[PDB]
Amino acid sequence: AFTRAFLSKSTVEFDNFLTCPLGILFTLGILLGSGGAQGKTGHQIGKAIRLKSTSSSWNPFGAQEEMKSLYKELNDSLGSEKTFDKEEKVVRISTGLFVQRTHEIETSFNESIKNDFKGELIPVNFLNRTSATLSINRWVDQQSNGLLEKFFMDDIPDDTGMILVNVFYFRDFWESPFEPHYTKIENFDISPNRQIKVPMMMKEEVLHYGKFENQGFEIVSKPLNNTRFTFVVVLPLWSLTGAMELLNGNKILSEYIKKLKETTVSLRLPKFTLKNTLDLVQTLKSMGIVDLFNPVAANLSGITHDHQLYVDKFMQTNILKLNESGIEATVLPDIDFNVNHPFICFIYDQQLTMPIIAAKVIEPI
């Protein structure tokens, strides 16, 4: 499927990885759905999303409406999820199309991104590359409510090309938070040679466990306050590559989630924060979208019909900060589950059954 294709060509890029293939879809749903990407260009997108209408033949009108409802379907769902003592959105997704101001955008394309998607068109001047970058930095700093300030893009396109940015943010409490009285400082076996300290978080409770001496990666799942989403940690029994097979899409996660039984667990978990800016232009080509990031052969006539443009940079930026209290929020055990060497964690969806956020941690920040 899509999420299983993305993690394939995204994880081969590695060191501390952090990606959210959930919203990257959203970034690109806003290309097909609105009607921006026509021809070969947008067809290659529908195909990579593996949707019905692209299965048989190019049919422009058709794949727009099916992406528009597919997006809108998943989009109110992650929005229908509200957590606290004032109700707050649990999932947070902004998606930004930064474009040369001079271009007469089609009023249909502009009508759709506003009333059809939750996303935002930003008209800026790339000639003023200096003033151009800060516009982006102010945009992302305004969307992440300060969590992701200091995002500075090293290079800018020469007038025709575009820049997309996607900011996923997942905020929630634990279902059973950690006592800070027991968050002590402990070693973390990075390698034989380097070992660092970190604030380990010790709690014992009933959590769904799973050992797989089959592959070599034991599994734990801690649910958040909103029980639909679970936080999953994958520990090797230091094999390391045995776990990644889950991370690059060779192994379905749910497939493994399903064998997790109620257990008592002595959980010791590092306090850490993961932030990780990524470019998906060399990823979305190897995954079958190569006619979009190319100036000669990109067809974004749905946006403008006076000057030809393409996508220069497809940027993503994420923040995962774990605390005793939850994620971004401030009993006799039968299983020990100490996490002091590198691991692979997920924010798993229990309804959509997909890992919205899949991360590989080498050294905890």
Residue numbers in the entry: 21 to 34, 37 to 106, 109 to 261, 264 to 356, 369 to 403
Task: Reproduce passages from the article.
Serpins are proteins distributed among all kingdoms of life that act mostly as Serine protease inhibitors, but also as inhibitors of other classes of proteases, although some that lack inhibitory activity can serve as chaperones or storage proteins. Serpins from parasites are interesting immunodiagnostic targets, due to their presence at the parasite-host interface, where they are crucial for the adaptation and survival of the parasite to the host environment by modulating inflammatory response. Among these, SmSPI is able to weakly inhibit chymotrypsin and is expressed mostly in the parasite’s head gland, confirming its localization in the parasite-host interface, thus its potential as a diagnostic target.
In this context, we present the 3.22 Å resolution crystal structure of the S. mansoni circulating antigen SmSPI together with flanking immune sera recognition tests using sera from affected patients. The SmSPI structure presents the fold and topology of a canonical Serpin composed of 3 β-sheets (named βA, βB, βC, assigned according to the conventional Serpin nomenclature) and 10 α-helices. Electron density was well defined for the main chain atoms except for some flexible, loop regions. The major region with no electron density is the Reactive Centre Loop (RCL; residues 357 to 368), which is highly flexible and solvent exposed; its function is indeed to act as a bait for the target protease to exert the Serpin inhibitory activity. Other poor electron density regions were for several solvent exposed loops (AA 35–36, 107–108, 262–263), in accordance with other deposited Serpin structures. Three SmSPI epitopes were identified: Ep1: 123-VQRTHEIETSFNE-135; Ep2: 175-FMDDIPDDTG-185; Ep3: 320-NPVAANLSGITHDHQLYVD-338. All three identified epitopes are clustered together in the same region of the protein. SmSPI showed to be able to bind human IgG in sera from people affected by Schistosomiasis, while the response of the protein to healthy serum resulted to be significantly lower (p < 0.001).
